[PDB]
Structure 1
Amino acid sequence: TSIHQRLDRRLSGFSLEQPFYTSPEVYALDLQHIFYKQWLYAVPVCQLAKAGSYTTLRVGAYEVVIVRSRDGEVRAFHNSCRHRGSLICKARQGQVAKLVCPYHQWTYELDGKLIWANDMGPDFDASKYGLKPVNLRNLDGLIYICLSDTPPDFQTFAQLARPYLEVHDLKDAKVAFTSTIIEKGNWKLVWENNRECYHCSSNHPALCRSFPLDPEVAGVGVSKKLQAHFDRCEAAGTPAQFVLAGDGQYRLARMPLQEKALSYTMDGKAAVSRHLGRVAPPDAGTLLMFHYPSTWNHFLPDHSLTFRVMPISPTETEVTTTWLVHKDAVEGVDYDLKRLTEVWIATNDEDREIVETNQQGILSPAYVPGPYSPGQESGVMQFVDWYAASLERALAP
């Protein structure tokens, strides 16, 4: 059986056949044509708010480092020394003058420029052996990167995005806290969990307090109190109106939080005293922002959350949640760290458990596609479709 044959006979209303979540062949194809080629959420730029700052991430097999120059820009490169391929930047995050390879001290400037290589003598050009760039975009506070040499368009997404995102002044955030977890499920199944709300009824006693459960919010023609809600925000000059890429990849909507909620706290109250950005009115709700395959976010009036989805193996996905708060918000005065993060640390573990159980269930050669609820999983069907369509595009000539 071919992938082509499996993709052919895929009907729209169903979960995928086994090999999409279990086989290393699909994994390889997903790496190849989706993670290595599309735009990926990396890091907010508040991690690199000093020159020389750097951060590193692995994408599939690639070792990337994103760093800030003296010249002010954020460039990103392949973390493999051009001499014999050593990592340059080990530590997760940090600060240097130059990029100095710890094997043989070949030193690069912070724009790649190889400016010293030792006893490489007469035949040696250094113009050939600079660090390999990785295309990189700054999206009003979020660094996305792209490992293809010929990236897709970012700018159309960048342009729908800016207005909903400017009001957060994400450039003026600081990381309060960062959580990595690794879920023992396929990266696709992470997305399926997230693009529904449905299980949430009996799987998240915390979030629910604060986050909607009505499938309109995180589901896929606009209800009546919603335009009203979009309206109060836009009258206010906070963009709120639902918008959804025509390819299905990315989406914008500032959604009302569960009756009364102001933030993702136990008490529905602000998490930080010093709000981030200029969101307005107070109760504008939560900005949802997804972007297949790499991120979803919840941008509140008090603080911001990124999530970064990264695949590790056919049945493992690294999910990185980051808390963003104003740079002058003090821990202990302005916010309390526990209180700032208990809701979602709880919610992410509940999902993980859920994803992990699903994964296991799926590994049964007895598993066959069953049907999505059109009432609760229409947003899941939407992911799967963007997914299949992306694999077909990448696979023709």
Structure 2
Amino acid sequence: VEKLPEDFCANPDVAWTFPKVFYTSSQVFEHEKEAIFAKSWICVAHGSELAQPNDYITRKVIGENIVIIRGKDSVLRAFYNVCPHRGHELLSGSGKAKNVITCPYHAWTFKLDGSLALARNCDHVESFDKENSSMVPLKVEEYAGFVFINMDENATCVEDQLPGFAERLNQACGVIKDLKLAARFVTETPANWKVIVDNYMECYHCGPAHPVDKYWHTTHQNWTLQYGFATDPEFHGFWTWPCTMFNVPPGSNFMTVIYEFPVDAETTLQHYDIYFTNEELTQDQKDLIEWYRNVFRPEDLNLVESVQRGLKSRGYRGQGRIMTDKQRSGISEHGIAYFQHLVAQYHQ
């Protein structure tokens, strides 16, 4: 039971990162898994993957295999991807469901709303409860053009978690509804999910790690915006609680999105999604995909993997200095302090 003070990182001008145990402890991870990831809205996809009846996707986060499915009735729902009879998985990959889901094991059959449609011989089983033998649901919400799930069925909506975010994202990219998935990079990353957020929250490393008429990192309520000018081309980098990042590069007509799906204390599954409105890509778009694939993302992944190894050394003396400057300049690290102050509230 590692603990942090309430004002941890409350003053970004004099602040340090978490004691290293928070990036490595399996007990810390189990606490964050239940207190954060099982109670927060988790972004899983852009709405375009789920726009048509019978569309489905699958996702894996904190050990939970989830199916998100647009019903025959065009209603979006989410379920745990596990049969309520004896635990076989139900669907794999993504695509179009048939009009019923059939369990591979004993062929219990479910409508796309999760209701049990047919369970062989169940009229002969004593005290069989057909309603309450349905697929088990999660909360799902379409917000800001993206799709969020929540394992806490008592949760309130995404706007309560990210006040003002949808409004500001739509003022960064006006064509979100027209975006389509152009490429996805899936990486099982050997770093704690918070190291990856840390790395996003600063541009201190842009230049020395990646070979702008002012850059402002403003904090909001459970999200932040890195904003500036590269006409007058704007760029936007949004971090949202707990760990989904939305990038709107200069031009504001496409997006990249980083989805972090934590696995354990030192492992995070990442989706890096690239979205364009074209369904047939231009050469510029194809080259951009290859550049993200071969250069930009390998740089960022090598960084977090090396940091995760290095922070375990006894020569790394507990914590690292957050290099915040008084002027909140473009190379100031103060965004890390805002993130870590929010995390600290879950370790009281």
1:359 partnered with 2:315: no
- Give the secondary-structure state (helix, strand or coil) at the position aligned to 2:280: coil
Of the three residues 282, 285, 289, the one matched with 1:341 is 289
Paired residue for 2:205? 199
Paired residue for 2:186? 180
**Counterparts of 1:255 and 1:11 in 2: how far apart (Å)?**
25
**Counterparts of 2:263 and 2:213 in 1: how far apart (Å)?**
30
Paired residue for 1:279? none
Superposition deviation, residue 58 in structure 1: 1.0
**Counterparts of 1:8 and 1:244 in 2: how far apart (Å)?**
19
Answer whether contact 2:9 2:338 (CA < 8 A) is retained. Answer: no
Greater Cα offset, 334-343 or 118-127? 334-343
**Counterparts of 2:160 and 2:95 in 1: how far apart (Å)?**
31
**Counterparts of 1:161 and 1:199 in 2: how far apart (Å)?**
26
Greater Cα offset, 342-351 or 77-86? 342-351
More helix by percentage: 1
Superposition deviation, residue 178 in structure 1: 0.8
What are the within-5 Å matches in structure 2 for residues 59-208 of structure 1?
Answer: 59-122=61-124, 123-156=127-160, 160-166=164-170, 168-205=174-211
- Give the secondary-structure state (helix, strand or coil) at the position aligned to 2:207: helix
> Structure 2: where are the runs of 5+ without partners?
326-331
Superposition deviation, residue 329 in structure 1: 3.6
Answer whether contact 2:162 2:241 (CA < 8 A) is retained. Answer: no
- Counterpart residue identity of residue 220, structure 2: L
Superposition deviation, residue 347 in structure 1: 2.1
More strand by percentage: 2
Higher RCO (C-alpha 8 Å, min separation 6): 2
Paired residue for 1:369? 319
Superposition deviation, residue 142 in structure 1: 0.2
Of the three residues 49, 52, 57, the one matched with 2:51 is 49
**Counterparts of 2:47 and 2:185 in 1: how far apart (Å)?**
17
Superposition deviation, residue 23 in structure 1: 1.1
Deviation string for 1:273-320 (max 9, x for gaps)?
A: xxxxxxxxx754223222121201112422111110111221121221
- Counterpart residue identity of residue 3, structure 1: E
- Give the secondary-structure state (helix, strand or coil) at the position aligned to 2:105: coil
Superposition deviation, residue 93 in structure 1: 4.3
Paired residue for 1:234? none
Answer whether contact 1:372 1:381 (CA < 8 A) is retained. Answer: yes
**Counterparts of 1:9 and 1:296 in 2: how far apart (Å)?**
25
**Counterparts of 1:190 and 1:164 in 2: how far apart (Å)?**
23
Answer whether contact 2:8 2:340 (CA < 8 A) is retained. Answer: no
Superposition deviation, residue 361 in structure 1: 0.9
> Structure 1: where are the runs of 5+ without partners?
206-211, 221-242, 258-281, 393-397
- Counterpart residue identity of residue 99, structure 1: I
Instruction: Provide closer, same or farther for how the CA distance between residues 313 and 319 of structure 1 changes in structure 2, counting only shifts above 3 A.
Output: same
Answer whether contact 1:18 1:365 (CA < 8 A) is retained. Answer: no
Instruction: Provide closer, same or farther for how the CA distance between residues 58 and 253 of structure 1 changes in structure 2, counting only shifts above 3 A.
Output: same
Answer whether contact 2:110 2:116 (CA < 8 A) is retained. Answer: yes
- Give the secondary-structure state (helix, strand or coil) at the position aligned to 2:246: strand
1:3 partnered with 2:5: no
Instruction: Provide closer, same or farther for how the CA distance between residues 49 and 377 of structure 1 changes in structure 2, counting only shifts above 3 A.
Output: same
- Give the secondary-structure state (helix, strand or coil) at the position aligned to 2:52: coil
1:251 partnered with 2:224: yes
Superposition deviation, residue 42 in structure 1: 0.7
Paired residue for 2:329? none
**Counterparts of 2:77 and 2:98 in 1: how far apart (Å)?**
14
Per the normalisation by structure 2, the TM-score is 0.87
1:390 partnered with 2:341: no
- Give the secondary-structure state (helix, strand or coil) at the position aligned to 1:3: coil
Deviation string for 1:329-388 (max 9, x for gaps)?
A: 412xx4554323244332221111111111111111343113211122101111111111
- Give the secondary-structure state (helix, strand or coil) at the position aligned to 2:195: helix
Question: How big is the alpha-carbon RMSD for the aligned residues of Structure 1 and Structure 2?
Answer: 2.3
Answer whether contact 1:329 1:335 (CA < 8 A) is retained. Answer: no
